[PDB]
Write a protein that binds this ligand. Structure first.
Ligand SMILES: [Mg+2]
Length: 298
């Protein structure tokens, strides 16, 4: 703020850690009473990552409305996201229920099922057309319709059906497969190429429910993705890159879910992504093709 001048200053002084720790210190603290109820213990993947009560997504069921998911409602930018953990073997039904009830068109997955030798996410979508999934608890059917596999991400068309009404919806699944846990994308280009693929699909548009974004905990990689997207949208409103204060935007997001952006290098990457993305916002449409080439997506 102005972001590029600030970036160079932080870099020169090597103060990313300090800047980041300051963000952690200033971040909102709100209760997560529901997340911590004994009955919800097996609905949380990580003991120390919980949705705030005020912003949690409620499932539309009388039995137990709890899922570890938060609505990030960015008022100034006029965009909302649902950030959630990687579903557990017992919460895959809840996950798709949330997708249905919230009217989401897209799901953005930023992790792999196995990372660092451990299971980070349930296999919550079908990998083969002929082997659809039925979630008996929430009465939903999920079918793989097609997939487009690129070098570092895959886009799937899924059909989600409410078996109670027989209504069906197409859900687009955007799976980034090369973003390491507690790490950063290979380049601003690869990240932005993917973000713009999600944008171009219509998944982020106001006529749909909020896009669902997740990684393993739904805070580190998910937070980075949403921060970059929101900053670029804010810039787009006024065509005024200088008006965007990335740290303030992140603090605003953290009012809705804890721990968004998990490392100083993820914060630094967010600046890189927004600064590079600004080229497109400010009218250099050709830069999108450059990102595609540099991403080596195939
Ligand atoms: Mg086959």
């Amino acid at each position: 703020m102005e972001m590029e001048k600030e970036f160079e200053q932080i870099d020169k002084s090597g103060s990313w850690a300090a800047i980041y720790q300051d963000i952690r210190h200033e971040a909102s603290d709100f209760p997560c009473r529901v997340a911590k109820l004994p009955k919800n213990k097996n609905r949380n993947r990580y003991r120390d990552v919980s949705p705030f009560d005020h912003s949690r997504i409620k499932l539309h069921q009388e039995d137990n409305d709890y899922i570890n998911a938060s609505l990030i409602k960015m008022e100034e930018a006029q965009r909302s996201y649902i950030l959630t953990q990687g579903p557990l073997p017992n919460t895959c039904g809840h996950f798709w229920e949330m997708v249905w009830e919230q009217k989401s068109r897209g799901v953005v997955m930023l992790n792999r099922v196995m990372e660092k030798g451990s299971l980070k996410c349930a296999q919550y979508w079908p990998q083969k057309e002929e082997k659809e999934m039925i979630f008996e608890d929430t009465n939903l059917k999920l079918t793989l319709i097609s997939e487009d596999i690129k070098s570092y991400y895959t886009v799937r068309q899924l059909e989600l059906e409410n078996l109670t009404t027989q209504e069906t919806r197409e859900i687009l699944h955007f799976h980034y497969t090369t973003w390491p846990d507690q790490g950063v994308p290979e380049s601003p280009a690869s990240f932005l190429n993917f973000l713009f693929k999600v944008r171009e699909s219509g998944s982020l548009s106001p006529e749909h429910g909020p896009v669902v974004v997740h990684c393993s905990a739904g805070i580190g990689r998910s937070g980075t993705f949403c921060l970059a997207d929101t900053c670029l949208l804010l810039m787009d409103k006024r065509k005024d890159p200088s008006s965007v204060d990335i740290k303030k935007v992140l603090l605003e997001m953290r009012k809705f879910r804890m721990g968004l952006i998990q490392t100083a290098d993820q914060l630094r990457f967010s600046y890189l992504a927004v600064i590079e993305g600004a080229k497109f916002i400010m009218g250099d449409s050709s830069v999108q093709d450059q990102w595609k080439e540099l991403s080596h997506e195939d």
